[PDB]
């Protein structure tokens, strides 16, 4: 049974609600992004209208085989009428194709559903500038002040400089980058660009990347692993055993691996600057954990909410414990008292 924080009151609409069977009263199912916790339940047998971005619709058709007649892609930044209700899709600054949804309810209430997002000051000059929001359904993944991490630009600068130094010292070093979902493509694209290489990967991952509308993608990626010195592997293989095994397969082309694990936050963020990050090393293999986040930090979330001044907040993450719910409610009241709304 579908939980309350996935229903949009006053509509026939749900958000990210495909694992509950046929939801009573639902006439249109929105999908914010192509991450498995959110699409859980969708397949080629789905026969209700799915509303989403173009990129998400490419993934639904090619990866999950949902039939074309049920996929309803909408352009971004554009007022659209769906089943008699005005909606807008906004870029969420999460993974490719990820949106926030603005719903203009028939009674005059305005609702923002962030989906998953990484708040940014640029969102203060979107279509959100123009009107008031009564209800905010908020991605609260990192809603606590201990969750700190650098900008995505600082993280990429560290990765590019680290990879370029290692391979210039040793032209026979291979770079490997872990993946388990869409998102965080800039990690491996920026490294391959500084090295003058295409990125090599499995046929299954190539297919996924081909759905993302990335400019000049055919110039950037390949399934011919032997021609490439940046390889993508499943995240589960990014350990000394999996990497050893991979280096065997390369036919003595390489004699060293430098590997990256983009994580979200880890507690080593509580002590260490990005600049001071060091790898784990065993022989000719080194592994870096890099804090590349596609979710808001505490400070970025607080800024966004203090700007938007919603009348009510409904969290969509960390909702399963009373302690998490109480913590999040305390910070919402601080923010409101401090800013005066
Ligand atoms: Ni996500």
From Swiss-Prot:
Up-regulation conditions: During mitosis. The mRNA encoding this protein contains an internal ribosome entry site (IRES) in its 5'-UTR. This 5'-UTR generally suppresses translation while specifically promoting expression during mitosis, when cap-dependent translation may be impaired.
Localization per Swiss-Prot or TrEMBL: Nucleus
Highest taxon listed in the record's lineage: Eukaryota
Expression tissues: Expressed in brain, heart, kidney, liver, pancreas, placenta and skeletal muscle.
Complex and partners: Binds constitutively to TP53BP1. Binds CDC27, which is itself a component of the anaphase promoting complex (APC). Binds PIAS1.
Family: Belongs to the DNA repair metallo-beta-lactamase (DRMBL) family.
Role summary: May be required for DNA interstrand cross-link repair. Also required for checkpoint mediated cell cycle arrest in early prophase in response to mitotic spindle poisons. Possesses beta-lactamase activity, catalyzing the hydrolysis of penicillin G and nitrocefin. Exhibits no activity towards other beta-lactam antibiotic classes including cephalosporins (cefotaxime) and carbapenems (imipenem).
Protein name: DNA cross-link repair 1A protein
The organism of origin for this protein: Homo sapiens (Human)
Source species taxonomy: Eukaryota, Metazoa, Chordata, Craniata, Vertebrata
